[PDB]
Design a protein around this ligand. Structure first.
Ligand SMILES: [Mg+2]
Ligand SMILES: [Zn+2]
Lengths: 49, 63, 573, 54, 236, 89, 702, 225
């Protein structure tokens, strides 16, 4: 997230979760993971208030 | 503070809410479930709860 | 429908029965009615049957892992003391009839009854909310029955034979009625190729264009080269559904049911599924699937393979005793040798077992079972694990049919107890994860129709292609389906193939691949401009209903339950 | 064959039994008679080899 | 003994030749006794007449196609097997079919001999091309049930005969379904439902009556061992 | 035409006698069909339990009921028959 | 017997079910001969509870010892030594199944041995210095009664061992056709059998007492318990199996127990079984039964229930048990005797009065309407509260015994108690839908259908099958032990005669001399790890003798051509048939069914209680709330939370509306929320509910 | 088309067994007739069996009689094996009463006129020198299987012990077809059915009753057209 951007961290999280879920033959659509990934990136830190 | 208190670490959440004097607006699934009010999802939203149903004019006159 | 014991139903519906039998003048007042109900008078039962008409009840089985764990059924009275459950909803409830119990709840108010009839009816929840694959589909016995019914056997009695120089064609029937009359006389088998004239089944979307230039209307006659079982199965399907003429594996039936759900109303799909269940149950008992000691055969080359691998292991051990080896190297070599022996034994068993074997019929049809279980039952048990999680250099070379020794059984007990102890911890961790996910994503609720946002998410359809053919990605059914495009699909020599706002589907993906487009920009909830929650267009197609997601539906809970439900079967490696 | 009156039941066993099954309730009766200090426990302890039965 | 309630039979028309007979109430377990026996008797007891073998002029050795007509041998055979015919003589009889010139050959072009009649004069048989002829000789026998195509009974005396399967029974398809009903706190009485489809040469009610009569004759033959034994009396 | 006549099915039994898809076409969404039916059933039930000697305000069942048909069933039948109208809030 | 031989790792000074990881719940290689690795609970206590082995002893210091045979110079001696784990590690122990010569010399140079860390290896015969006693040394008592144990998976064996302890006693018991030999000892040492003390002859034998004369000249009288209630409600009675004048010997069984036939353990019945699907009634582990079991009382058990009521000494008055019962009809008290209790042998239905007790009520202010009614009808208002004992919901039977305790009769009653009467109700329960049946191999399943005699598929001889099992459940669970048991059971109850002409058959070279022929209805014994093999079983199947008609119904593959009961057409393919010994488990719908419309409520929080005995409701947990939220049904969730659980006014208003046929009122505020608010204010937290204006809303409405 | 009507013949195998042959029959029709006859024989053949007993000194089933080796439950289980034929519609009463040492069998029961016991050799109970047995039984007619009728429903006394009744006198029925009858074609079945009874009624009477019931059913199935 710090180096590349907010897009690459979302891609990485979705891909890493799907790799674990696809290894056991379980089909889950990405829109279910995307809600959880969205809920994890809703806040920012304050350094120059 | 109600959902956070119901979720985990009740003592710390209650202490922080008491110190901050936070106000709960009661808009959520868990908060409305706790107090017995209709949840703001599905049929509990204002669009669907305020439906007015009346017989049509043709059936009103025919019957 | 569900079966409800009469005593339990009387206890649940006690106030309704009291009111109704007071109205019918069977009791003078409320106290007399209550006394009559408690005494269980003969006239109570008629009132009870009158009052449970069209009054849905909810059946729930703990644990409730997803939405389909609570469904509404229409009650019925039975003599016994056990709740009768439909066999097609066992998969939805994850229930097996070996001592399981279910709880029944009674809605009271008008809103609760309306919600039970419309939202939570068992006929309206056929498709999973997670992946969209159907759950109320034939399985186990029904799949085996349909597989036996629809398969084809060469050389069967009364098969089709080409015309010779002295005799005409043998095996041509003028109607399926004559075919049924013939098999009852023993001159025909349901698994023999014939040519039967059909007048009530639609042509398979290929012969229709060749024969009927305008179209196929009921009463038109055409000649089909199939088997009587496939004719019966296509009679089970709706009238306007084209003739299939395929062997009905589990995947084939899943595809057919998905197509029916996409093209036909849900009531038609429910009726078709019920008919398929009835036919599968009727034909499953005549499939001749039995388990016997003789049917559990062993390969003849198993002994030679075991002898050769034992000789190799003895040579390795002798080399180790000479000092030119290490314990770790010897263990690794033994593990590799025994794994190769197990693979060879499994291949030999698979080759030796006839295709008509009941075990092979069960395994291959997709009902249940695995190749590993079949190998374990007949052949070599394979490598075993220490209680600390380490492969043992000495495997179990004796199958269960032959009979294990004392120490091999001891090691098997080690492994089984380890697995049983690990399963509970895995399930508890899955439950905790599901709880956290549900409690996190609860404010994600659809609030609007469209947020009018140009942003999106890049999704790849084809990566390279072996020679520019643009081979479809193997994971496109869970990345690009049920999403709405953000920008028009433009390729070289810019032409608008798919317009903005078009819900992607299989035809859309096929058109995009045929036009030379590899990537698309689909809208997703990650980049949404809605003030509160998400909107309908960004979320896209709902995986359960099959259409656009309704406004006000709680999607966070659905997503959390879908993610956390497959936690018990997620074995750590 | 140890039990005097037993129903006849042909067996597939191929190995001679060197030792008969011990009493299945000794695990508690022997412990309790040790706790009380019965005479039979005293005799068993004396025969088994001991220094001071208590 | 006496039955609790006398069963009743009703008819429900479904099409021009079809019905859905319902028998209820029945004692628990008698529905399956009645259903399969009635189905078998309906299918293989009723006598009838059907085409046994045919000989097509111009096709002697190679049974592949008939020149001058669009339909080949197989389609003509399939069309002829669906012809309904009632014969009065038990011995086999021979019919003729002659058509000259282009047109559509229907079942009404067949000349019926004495005692032989057809019930569907509007059945399509073959479509002749321009300047074509079609002469087919049909043999009609009488019997019951469905008998497969018996091979030639001669060692080469006749070569043009084409044996075909014979559907003697006027009833084509019978399917029976048994359900459960309740009378007085008894959810075990069985209700029998029979769906019978027949040709136009007989009505389904007549077929059911004939099957019932034959079954009554059979079980009366079984009954004559002791006519004064205690049984279950239905009533009036 | 088979495609035009795709709405062919056997006679529905019991709780599914009004086809769900036709009801959905009548209303706007499954939620604003549950509310529709519930409010109509409440109006019908208030009509049944009305005093009779007061003022008649709530309209009774616009369709002919059965012997002991539930008010919700009558409401659903009226909805399927295009005998009512609603306005969302 | 299993409970008396249990090893528990929980309690004071031990582990706990929560503070125990996957380190102690494993089978250490030192459990061989000291603790059974199969028998253990399958719930949360897996691995923390086990059972002793058959041969295990206990050291004086508290260690567990097991016997081994000392072998020196490759010759097995006849001296048995008991070695603990520490003494076993130093030595090397061989296998009990290793072949031996007539003297003890090992025939093979390679012998399976166990080293210090297990290390199962082959060593020379001279290195061996110890040997096991029997192949079944590692198993416990319960696990040693499962035939063909080695062919079953460990999970299936565990489930079979656990379910084998839940069988109920039947009216008449029958020993299994195929056993393991650990049934005489288990029955004798269990303690529920009667064992003669000294040899002699039987003088008087009756259903309630047995008198045995002795050679010394001493008469022994044995009292037999008849229909005595056990701890779990089952019936335990003893019946003699001896006759007057018969000569008995010391140690011989005289009277059977509940589950015993001629001194052998017998927990179930031998039923003809067919392995085939049948119209979907046996789908997903269900079982189809014949009506002959119900008609002939094959699977019938007797259950005895005890009801007790006490009339203690109260502060406000004295409690007296008598048939006053001020407010009843006249027909209710027909069965009561002069003292106000039912008569012995009088059948009691649900709601009937068993014991009539009237307790003082005290001075209470009756409502004016009640006073007016009592004045009009003349029924005087006496300060008495009716506390008559009634049969609980869903129970019935026949009264068999009444015991009355009184303080004045010099009885050690607890202080403050004056009268105490206990009434026993006996009931016979036949098999029915919902009852659970299971075998010895871990195959369980509820009964989903009981077909009549005629509908069951029948053998060509005409014998209908009694139980039908699904085919798909066998291959996916690895329990071919049940198939082998079925084959051997069919061989057992058919008689066999091996054709020894022209030489002994090759497959029967190792068979004992007494197994070459056996009559019909014979019994066989298959020990746990040393019993019948596949080849011998196949040979016995192929060499059975025909029935009375001179024909063989089952061919060499163990399959038969079953007909169809309801169609008459034979099944197109042969179906496996045979006799399987099944058990009736103690999971009956008569005890599991539960329902509630309105019952008791708790005190601190106004919520319904829990439990069948307390007439409580079913818990609507958090997961069900998540499911309801996911569906979108807000109103059902609101009603379930408020007006069925906590809304105090809401409950009574809903009940009145339902009775009167009006509309269900709008829910209010649950009492649990107010309890939470009062608990928060007790922690010096100023929780206040604000309205739209901003002023607080009082919660003291009333 | 064959005009040869089927005929039925009987051959005896034992005293209580018989074998009946029906021929000729149409192909595919031998099995169904045999199945219908077997179901009717096993389901709707009337008979007679006991329904209630009353021992002298007992009040319920769960007790024991002094001086008797078998308790009341075992006596009731043994009494269910009696084969008794009655020709009187209303219930009759039989009496059993033996005193002193001996073995009580089915031969000690004295039945009234019109009621007989066909197995005077079964075992009921055994008595020592101090035992007396006096039990009266009730015999009623019917068919099928009827469970116990409770005292509350029947309004009986306390000493009356209801007993389950099995009125069916048929033990085992099977059938087999031959397909050997030839007149002009070799595809005609030949039904062969085996009937065995409990000696209460001869197999001929059982087959006649089954034929009568099926005649009534298949006649009402055609007369109401
Ligand atoms: Mg389960
Ligand atoms: Zn958006």
């Amino acid at each position: 997230l710090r180096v590349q951007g907010p897009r690459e961290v979302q891609i990485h999280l979705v891909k890493e979760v799907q790799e674990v879920y696809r290894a056991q033959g379980v089909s889950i659509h990405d829109k279910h993971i995307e809600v959880i990934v969205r809920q994890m990136l809703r806040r920012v830190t304050i350094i120059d208030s | 503070w109600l959902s956070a208190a119901s979720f985990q670490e009740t003592t710390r959440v209650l202490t922080d809410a008491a110190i901050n004097c936070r106000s709960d607006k009661l808009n959520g699934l868990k908060e409305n479930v706790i107090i017995g009010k209709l949840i703001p999802a599905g049929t509990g939203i204002s669009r669907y709860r305020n439906i007015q149903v009346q017989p049509t004019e043709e059936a009103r006159a025919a019957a | 429908q569900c079966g409800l014991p009469k005593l339990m139903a009387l206890e649940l519906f006690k106030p309704f029965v009291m009111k109704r039998l007071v109205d019918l003048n069977h009791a003078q007042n409320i106290k007399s009615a209550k006394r009559m109900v408690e005494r269980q008078r003969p006239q109570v039962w008629d009132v009870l049957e009158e009052v449970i008409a069209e009054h849905p009840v909810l059946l729930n089985r703990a644990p409730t892992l997803h939405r389909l764990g609570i469904q509404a059924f229409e009650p019925q009275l039975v003599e016994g003391k056990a709740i009768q459950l439909h066999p097609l909803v066992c998969e939805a409830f994850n229930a097996d009839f070996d001592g399981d119990q279910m709880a029944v709840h009674l809605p009271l108010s008008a809103e609760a009854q309306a919600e039970a009839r419309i939202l939570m009816l068992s006929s309206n929840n056929i498709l999973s909310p997670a992946s969209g694959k159907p759950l109320a589909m034939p399985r186990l016995d029904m799949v085996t029955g349909l597989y036996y019914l629809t398969t084809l056997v060469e050389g069967a009695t009364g098969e089709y034979q080409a015309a010779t120089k002295d005799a005409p064609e043998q095996g041509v029937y003028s109607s399926p009625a004559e075919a049924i009359m013939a098999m009852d006389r023993g001159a025909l088998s349901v698994r023999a190729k014939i040519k039967v004239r059909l007048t009530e089944l639609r042509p398979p979307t290929d012969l229709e264009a060749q024969l009927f230039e305008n179209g196929w209307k009921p009463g038109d006659a055409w000649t089909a080269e199939t088997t009587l079982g496939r004719v019966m199965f296509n009679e089970l399907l709706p009238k306007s559904y084209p003739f299939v003429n395929e062997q009905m594996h589990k995947k084939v039936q899943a595809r057919i049911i998905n197509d029916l759900a996409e093209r036909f109303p849900m009531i038609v799909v429910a009726q078709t599924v019920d008919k398929l269940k009835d036919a599968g149950f009727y034909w499953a008992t005549r499939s001749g699937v039995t388990v016997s000691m003789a049917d559990v055969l062993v390969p003849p080359q198993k002994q030679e393979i075991l002898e050769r691998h034992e000789a190799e292991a003895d040579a390795i051990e002798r080399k180790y005793q000479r000092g030119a080896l290490n314990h770790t190297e010897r263990n690794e070599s033994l593990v590799k040798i025994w794994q190769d022996a197990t693979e060879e034994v499994g291949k030999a068993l698979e080759e030796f077992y006839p295709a008509d074997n009941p075990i092979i019929t069960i395994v291959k049809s997709g009902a249940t079972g695995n190749l590993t279980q079949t190998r374990t039952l007949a052949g070599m048990k394979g490598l075993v694990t220490n209680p600390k999680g380490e492969f043992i250099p000495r495997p179990i070379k004796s199958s269960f049919r032959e009979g294990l020794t004392v120490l091999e059984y001891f090691i098997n007990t080690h492994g089984a107890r380890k697995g049983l102890a690990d399963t509970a911890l895995r399930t508890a961790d899955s439950g905790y994860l599901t709880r956290r996910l549900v409690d996190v994503s609860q404010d994600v609720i659809v609030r609007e129709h469209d947020c009018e946002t140009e942003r999106g998410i890049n999704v790849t359809l084809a990566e390279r292609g072996p020679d520019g053919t643009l081979i479809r990605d193997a994971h496109v059914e869970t990345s690009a389906f049920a999403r709405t495009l953000a920008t028009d699909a433009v390729d070289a020599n810019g032409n608008v193939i798919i317009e903005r706002g078009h819900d992607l589907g299989d035809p859309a993906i096929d058109a995009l691949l045929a036009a030379g487009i590899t990537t698309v920009k689909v809208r997703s909830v990650l980049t949404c401009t809605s003030a509160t929650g998400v909107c309908a267009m960004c979320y896209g197609r709902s995986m359960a209903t099959g259409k656009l997601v309704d406004i006000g539906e709680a999607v966070g809970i659905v997503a959390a339950q879908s993610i956390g439900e497959p936690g018990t079967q997620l074995t750590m490696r | 064959n140890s039990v005097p009156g037993a129903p006849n039941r042909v067996s597939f066993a191929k190995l001679r039994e060197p030792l008969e099954v011990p009493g299945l309730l000794d695990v508690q009766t022997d412990s309790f008679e040790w706790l009380v200090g019965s005479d039979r426990w005293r005799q068993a302890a004396i025969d088994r080899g001991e220094e001071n039965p208590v | 003994m006496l039955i609790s309630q006398r069963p009743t039979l009703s008819e429900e028309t479904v099409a021009e030749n079809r019905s859905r007979f319902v028998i209820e109430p029945l004692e628990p377990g008698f529905g399956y006794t009645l259903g399969n026996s009635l189905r078998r008797t309906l299918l293989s007891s009723i006598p009838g007449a059907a085409v046994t073998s045919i000989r097509i002029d111009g096709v002697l050795h190679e049974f592949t196609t008939v020149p001058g007509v669009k339909e080949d041998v197989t389609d003509i055979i399939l069309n002829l097997k669906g012809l309904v015919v009632s014969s009065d003589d038990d011995e086999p009889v021979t019919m003729y079919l002659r058509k000259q010139g282009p047109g559509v050959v229907t079942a009404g072009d067949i000349v019926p001999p004495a005692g032989v009649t057809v019930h569907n004069p509007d059945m399509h048989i073959a479509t002749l091309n321009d300047k074509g002829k079609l002469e087919v000789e049909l043999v009609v026998e009488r019997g019951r049930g469905y008998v497969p195509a018996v091979q030639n009974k001669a060692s080469g005396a006749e070569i043009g005969r084409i044996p075909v399967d014979s559907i003697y029974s006027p009833v084509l398809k019978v399917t029976y379904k048994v359900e459960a009903t309740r009378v007085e706190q008894r959810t075990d009485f069985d209700k029998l439902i029979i769906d019978v489809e027949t040709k136009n040469s007989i009505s389904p009610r007549d077929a059911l009556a004939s099957a019932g009569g034959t079954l009554v004759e059979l079980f009366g033959l079984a009954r004559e061992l002791n006519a004064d034994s205690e049984h279950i009396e239905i009533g009036p | 035409i088979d495609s035009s006549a795709a709405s062919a099915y056997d006679t529905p039994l019991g709780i599914t006698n009004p086809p769900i898809d036709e009801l959905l076409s009548r209303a706007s969404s499954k939620y604003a069909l549950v509310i529709y039916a519930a409010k109509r059933a409440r109006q019908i039930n208030d009509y049944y339990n009305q005093l009779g000697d007061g003022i008649l305000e709530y309209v009774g069942p616009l369709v002919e009921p059965g012997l002991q048909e539930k008010p919700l069933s009558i409401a659903l039948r009226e909805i399927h028959g295009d005998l009512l109208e609603h306005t969302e809030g | 017997l299993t409970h008396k031989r249990r090893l528990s790792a929980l309690g004071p000074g031990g582990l706990s079910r929560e503070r125990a990881g996957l380190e102690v719940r494993d089978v250490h290689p030192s459990h061989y001969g000291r603790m059974c690795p199969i028998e253990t609970p399958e719930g949360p206590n897996i691995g923390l509870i086990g059972s002793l082995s058959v041969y295990a002893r206990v050291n004086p210091f508290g260690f567990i010892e097991t016997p081994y045979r000392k072998v020196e110079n490759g010759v097995v001696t006849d001296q048995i030594d008991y070695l603990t784990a520490d003494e076993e590690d130093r030595h090397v122990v061989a296998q009990a199944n290793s072949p031996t010569d007539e003297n003890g010399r090992f025939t093979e140079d390679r012998v399976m041995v166990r080293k210090k860390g297990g290390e199962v290896e082959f060593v020379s015969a001279d290195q061996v210095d110890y040997m096991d006693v029997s192949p079944r040394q590692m198993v416990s008592v319960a696990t040693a009664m499962i035939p063909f144990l080695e062919h079953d998976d460990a999970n299936r064996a565990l489930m079979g061992a656990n379910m084998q302890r839940q069988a109920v006693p039947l009216v008449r018991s029958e020993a299994p056709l195929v056993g393991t030999g650990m049934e005489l000892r288990a029955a004798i040492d269990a303690g529920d059998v009667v064992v003669a003390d000294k040899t002699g002859v039987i003088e008087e034998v009756s259903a309630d007492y047995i008198t045995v004369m002795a050679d010394d000249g001493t008469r022994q009288s044995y009292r037999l318990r008849k229909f005595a209630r056990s701890n779990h409600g089952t019936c335990a009675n003893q019946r003699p199996i001896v006759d007057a004048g018969q000569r008995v010997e010391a140690g011989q069984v005289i009277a059977d127990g509940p589950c015993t036939q001629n001194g052998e353990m017998a927990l179930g019945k031998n039923l003809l079984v067919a392995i085939m699907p049948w119209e979907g009634h046996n789908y997903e582990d269900a079982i189809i039964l014949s009506n002959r079991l119900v008609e002939e009382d094959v699977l019938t058990s007797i259950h005895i229930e005890e009801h007790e009521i006490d009339a203690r000494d109260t502060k406000l008055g004295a409690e007296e048990i008598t048939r006053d019962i001020p407010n009843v009809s006249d027909e209710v008290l027909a069965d009561l005797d002069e003292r106000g209790i039912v008569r012995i042998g009088a059948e009691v239905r649900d709601g009937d009065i068993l014991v009539g007790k009237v307790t003082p009520k005290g001075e209470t202010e009756l409502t004016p309407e009640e006073r007016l009614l009592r004045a009009i009808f003349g029924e005087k208002a006496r300060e008495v509260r009716d506390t008559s004992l009634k049969v609980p919901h869903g129970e019935s039977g026949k009264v068999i015994g009444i015991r009355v305790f009184s303080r004045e009769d010099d009885d050690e009653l607890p202080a403050g108690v004056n009268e105490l009467v206990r009434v026993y109700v006996a009931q016979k329960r036949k098999i029915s839908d919902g009852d659970k049946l299971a075998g010895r191999h871990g195959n369980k399943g509820v009964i989903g259908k009981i077909l009549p005699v005629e509908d069951m598929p029948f053998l060509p001889d005409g014998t209908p099958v009694d139980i039908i099992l699904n085919t798909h459940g066998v291959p996916r669970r690895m329990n071919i032990g049940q198939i082998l048991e079925t084959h051997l059971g069919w061989v057992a109850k058919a008689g066999w005669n091996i054709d020894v002409a022209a030489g002994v058959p090759d497959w029967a070279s190792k068979l004992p001399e007494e197994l070459y022929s056996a009559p019909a209805d014979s019994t066989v014994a298959t020990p746990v790890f040393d019993g019948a093999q596949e080849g011998e079983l196949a040979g016995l199947l192929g060499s059975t003798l025909p029935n009375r008609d001179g024909e063989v119904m089952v061919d060499a593959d163990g399959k038969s051509t079953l007909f169809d009961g309801r169609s008459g057409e034979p099944f197109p393919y042969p179906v496996t048939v045979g006799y399987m010994y099944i058990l009736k488990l103690h999971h009956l719908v008569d005890d599991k069914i539960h329902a509630r419309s309105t019952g008791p409520y708790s005190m601190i929080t106004q919520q319904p209680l829990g439990g069948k005995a307390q007439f409580g409701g079913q818990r609507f947990g958090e997961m069900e709330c998540w499911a309801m939220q996911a569906y979108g049904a807000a109103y059902t969730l609101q009603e379930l939370l408020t007006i069925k659980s906590d809304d105090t006014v809401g409950r009574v208003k809903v009940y009145e509306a339902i009775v009167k046929g009006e509309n269900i009122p709008e829910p209010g505020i649950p009492e649990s929320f107010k309890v939470l608010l009062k608990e928060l204010q007790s922690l010096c937290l100023n929780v206040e509910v604000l309205s739209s204006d901003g002023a607080a809303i009082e919660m003291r409405d009333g």
